[PDB]
Amino acid sequence: GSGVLMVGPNFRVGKKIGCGNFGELRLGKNLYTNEYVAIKLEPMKSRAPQLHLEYRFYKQLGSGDGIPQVYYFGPCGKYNAMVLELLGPSLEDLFDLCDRTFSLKTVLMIAIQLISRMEYVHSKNLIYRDVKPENFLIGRPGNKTQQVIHIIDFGLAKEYIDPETKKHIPYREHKSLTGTARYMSINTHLGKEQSRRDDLEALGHMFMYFLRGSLPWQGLKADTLKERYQKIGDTKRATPIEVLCENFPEMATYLRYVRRLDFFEKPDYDYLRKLFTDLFDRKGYMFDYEYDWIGKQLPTPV
Numbered sequence: 051g052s053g054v055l056m057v058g059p060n061f062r063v064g065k066k067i068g069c070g071n072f073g074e075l076r077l078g079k080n081l082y083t084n085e086y087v088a089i090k091l092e093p094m095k096s097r098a099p100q101l102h103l104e105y106r107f108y109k110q111l112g113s114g115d116g117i118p119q120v121y122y123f124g125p126c127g128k129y130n131a132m133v134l135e136l137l138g139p140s141l142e143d144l145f146d147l148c149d150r151t152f153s154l155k156t157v158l159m160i161a162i163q164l165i166s167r168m169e170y171v172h173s174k175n176l177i178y179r180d181v182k183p184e185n186f187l188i189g190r191p192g193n194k195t196q197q198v199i200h201i202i203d204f205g206l207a208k209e210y211i212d213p214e215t216k217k218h219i220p221y222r223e224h225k226s227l228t229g230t231a232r233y234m235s236i237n238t239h240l241g242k243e244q245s246r247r248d249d250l251e252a253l254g255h256m257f258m259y260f261l262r263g264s265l266p267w268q269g270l271k272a273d274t275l276k277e278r279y280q281k282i283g284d285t286k287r288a289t290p291i292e293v294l295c296e297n298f299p300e301m302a303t304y305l306r307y308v309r310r311l312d313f314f315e316k317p318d319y320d321y322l323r324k325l326f327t328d329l330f331d332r333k334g335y336m337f338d339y340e341y342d343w344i345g346k347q348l349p350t351p352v
């Protein structure tokens with residue numbers, strides 16, 4: 051036939067975009083509306099499927115602020131595909147573009163939005179579990195949500211409230227480590243079941259990462275993943291919050307609060323946001339969405 055890969059009745063699959071994957075994220079086009087989209091692909095032969103249920107997580111999330119719109123899920127050649135709204139570059143891409151350091155203003159504008167974003171996700175009975183700069187993308191120049199920080203990849207998500215019992219998932223240990231070691235919470239390092247508190251702690255680690263330019267456990271290597279994980283964990287525990295957050299009192303207060311939350315406990319999202327909006331106002335900053343990357347030349351697939 052054609053020679054061209056189609057998804058559903060109107061989505062033309064195009065070049066693969068982004069870094070790493072390996073052909074799992076491709077640019078696409080909606081031939082019917084003449085709009086570009088992002089297409090996530092998973093070989094039907096996959097060992098550990100994640101696509102179809104990530105799709106289900108999106109259905110459960112519904113339409114939300116900062117949540118990419120999902121258009122289709124279906125077979126595509128020897129692939130299973132999920133089609134979503136095309137977005138802009140990730141926070142990691144922007145960080146590199148800004149010489150690997152964000153100003154406090156930029157970081158606070160990011161943190162205020164991400165705390166709300168996480169609260170939205172949690173309000174849908176889901177815990178994220180995959181916090182990292184690569185999973186947060188700004189909108190597209192023009193498509194009016196370019197200043198909005200979006201969250202992607204719910205492949206590692208989990209329902210923390212059992213749909214039938216309506217009870218919080220039970221506490222337990224011995225969970226295998228798979229997530230990204232640089233940002234994960236200390237309790238995650240200990241093999242404990244993750245809950246709402248962990249998503250928040252991970253955000254904190256990321257905030258300090260942006261503010262300092264790096265984290266003090268970032269260069270640890272070992273002979274086995276488990277060994278690398280343990281080392282990073284030991285250093286996180288061995289580094290006092292007052293040292294990690296030197297010169298950023300509010301960041302220390304945030305991190306101390308989340309690190310001390312109980313497993314079943316619902317975080318006080320308003321409290322955490324106010325720590326940052328109070329500081330923001332105190333510094334005299336204006337929440338005008340003028341991040342550090344404003345004015346630069348942004349990487350784009352199209």
Ligand SMILES: CC(C)(C)c1ccc(Nc2nc3ccc(C#N)cc3[nH]2)cc1
Nearest residue numbers: 068088136137138139202203349350351
């Ligand atoms: C920096 C560069 C690699 C060119 C780049 C690559 C892709 C996008 N845009 C983009 N929109 C997306 C929507 C959903 C998902 C998922 N899951 C990934 C995306 N990536 C923006 C910039």
